[PDB]
Structures are given as C-alpha cells and as structure tokens.
C-alpha cells in the first residue's frame, strides 16, 4: 500500500477479521448442539439450550458481528424447531 | 472586417447609385471591368444575388454577418423583408447617418468606431449596436469643438430627418420614438428578392 492511512487500516481490518471469525464460529457450535439435542428428541436440554443459543445470537447482533435481521431469522427457526418436538 | 475599396466600382455593377449622389457614377452608369459594355444575361439567380449585393454594400455589412440578420428576420412574426431592414436600419452608424451627423456611409462608421458617441451614458464603439425604442444617442464631451463634428451643424438641411427618429438642437442627441416600419425607409432596393435568395 502507498497512502499512510491504508497501512494503518490494513492492520485494523485484520484484527476485526480475527475478532468476527471467532464470534461467528461460536454461534455455529451453539446452533449445532441444539440440533444434536432436538434431533435426538430430548425436550429437556433442547428447551434450555434454546434459551442459551438465542441469548448468544442477540449478543453478536449488538457487537456488530451479524445483522439484527439475521439474529431474528435464526432464533425463529430454532424456536419453531422446539415446538415440533 | 471591412471592404475598404472603390465605392463607385461596386455601384456600377449593381446599376444603382448606392451612396447619395455621385458624379463618377452617371458618367459611366454601366458595370466595370474591361468587358463592361456588353449586355448581361437575364438570369433569375443574378436578379436575386445582385439584390442582396445592394443591401450589403449600402450598409457595409459582411456576408456571415448579414446572413444572421436574415435568420431572425424570417423568425419574427409579420413579414420577412419588412423585418430585415427594420433590424438593419436600427444599426447605430445608420442612425448617425439619417440624423445627418456625417456625409456618407463610411464616415458615419468611423464616428461610431473611434469612440465619439455614448448612448445612455454608455461609451460604445461598435457599429452594429442595434438601438431600440427610446434609445437616446448622445455625443461625447471631447467630441465637441472638433472639425468633423461641427461640420454637421450648419449642414442640417440638405437631407430630411425620418419620421421615426428626431434630432434636437445645440445638444446633438438623437431620440428614437419607435422602430421604423416601412414607409420612412429610403428605398433603393426591393425586399422580396433577398427573401427569395436564401430559400434556394
């Protein structure tokens, strides 16, 4: 890079990439553990991992990681995947 | 630009006394050149060209400038030959001529060109300044007590003042009541042949 403020911003992009990669990857495991609970047919852990997965999706939406409309799509899918059981 | 040449030679060819009065013309009222005595061929294009060549060297207007006068004369409502000379009579050096502040058409142009006239207290030096209704055309302060201007004070009788302008006394300032319509134009040219020239 050539402009002084683009060497400065190439470093601040790489921190925010490593920050957002770790937060998004935590949501894929917390969705998965609900999927492996609801597909087994427990209704015990899945009703108390629904409260904890949806609570992480809202916190990533306030940290500027996913969008507020994306949190509202994944929470409504998993809450409707509890009432099937 | 300007022609700046023999003024009789381009009045012999058109067969019409353009400048007012000539003794060089009417001694040879036939067209110039070494073949100046033979008869001409009656073409329809010649009678429309040499009618437009009248209007240029009468007023000292060039072809690229005279053509623009046609382009708005044909565009104003009314007629076309009427409004061609209407926007041609209102040139400032023509107003100085008809007011009698000169003798010929060329000397009425240098008096406008060399800065001897204001209009509304505005120092003009353009010959093609089209005056309008109510335009006073005054004269400069330095222009008085000068030889070619006070020659135009005792010679205020030999040519009439047209009905559309009006000259006043010891303050030589020319007042314009309205634009000239048709009848108070001096007519050496017919007007329905310049109109038929540019339609070719």
């Amino acid at each position: 890079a050539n402009i002084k403020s683009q060497q400065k911003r190439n470093r601040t992009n790489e921190r925010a990439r490593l920050r957002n990669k770790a937060v998004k990857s935590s949501l894929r495991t917390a969705v998965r553990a609900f999927r492996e609970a609801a597909h087994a047919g427990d209704k015990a852990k899945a009703a108390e991992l629904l409260a904890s997965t949806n609570r992480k999706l809202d916190k990533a939406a306030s940290k500027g990681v996913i969008h507020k409309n994306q949190a509202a799509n994944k929470k409504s899918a998993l809450a409707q995947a509890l009432n099937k059981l | 630009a300007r022609y700046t040449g023999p003024v009789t030679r381009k009045s012999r060819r058109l067969r019409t006394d353009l400048v007012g009065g000539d003794q060089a013309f009417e001694k040879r009222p036939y067209p110039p050149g070494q073949h100046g005595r033979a008869r001409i061929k009656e073409s329809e294009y010649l009678l429309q060209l040499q009618e437009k060549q009248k209007a240029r060297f009468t007023y000292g207007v060039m072809e690229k400038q005279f053509r623009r006068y046609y382009e708005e004369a044909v565009r104003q409502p009314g007629k076309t030959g009427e409004e061609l000379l209407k926007i041609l009579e209102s040139r400032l050096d023509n107003v100085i001529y008809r007011a009698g502040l000169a003798r010929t058409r060329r000397m009425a142009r240098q008096l406008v060109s060399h800065g001897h006239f204001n209009v509304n207290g505005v120092h003009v030096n353009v010959p093609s300044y089209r005056v309008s209704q109510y335009d006073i055309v005054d004269v400069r302060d330095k222009s008085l007590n000068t030889v070619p201007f006070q020659i135009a004070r005792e010679t205020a009788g030999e040519r009439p003042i047209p009905s559309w302008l009006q000259v006043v006394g010891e303050r030589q300032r020319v007042l314009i009541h309205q634009l000239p319509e048709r009848a108070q134009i001096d007519v050496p040219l017919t007007e329905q042949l310049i109109v038929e020239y540019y339609s070719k």
């Binding site: - | 209704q133 109510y134 006043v168």
Partner: protein, 113 residues
Amino acid sequence: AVKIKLTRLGKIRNPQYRVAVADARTRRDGRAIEVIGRYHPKEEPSLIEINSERAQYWLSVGAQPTEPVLKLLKITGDWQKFKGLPGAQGRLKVAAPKPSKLEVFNAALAAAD
C-alpha cells in the same frame, strides 16, 4: 447529510449561483432535490432570493446549510424565524430603482424644448 449549497452556473468571470437542496455525496452541478433560490454576487448590493416557505421546510426536517448559505439565510430573515432569534425581520437591502426607460426619454424632450 442533506446540504443546502451553492451551484456555479454563470459565465467564466460572472459566477451566477443557485441555492440547491443537494446531498453531501454529490458534485456541485449535480441533481438538486429542490432549487429554492439564487444568489448573484456581482451587483451593487447583491441579488438574493430565498423561497422562505420551502427553506423553512428543509430546515425543519434536517438540512444543513453550508457556510455561505448560512450567511444568506440570516440576511433574508429565514434563519432567525426558524431558531427563534429576535431578528426575524429582513435586513436584506435591494438596489435603488433607476429612472426607467420612458421617464428619462420624456424628460429629455422638455429639456431641449
């Protein structure tokens, strides 16, 4: 943001300006959203007109004037009546009416006769 700005649209040495409710992400002579006045800084006072009931619309909804337009809205009293300042009257001055084309022409008749 929404910027009320000036737009250069005269000759080379004669900058006739307009007053245009434009966007900040826009060049000068782009699409205005509503042209609400003109400003001619070559006359002897100057020539200033603001619509004064549409400039009250854009100020009441969030337009930000640029710094020479902020001077002009204080002159025509449209800035003061939006805020609540005491100077709600117009401190704008217009040029003096010159004697017209007909009245000077008739007066030159009676001066010679």
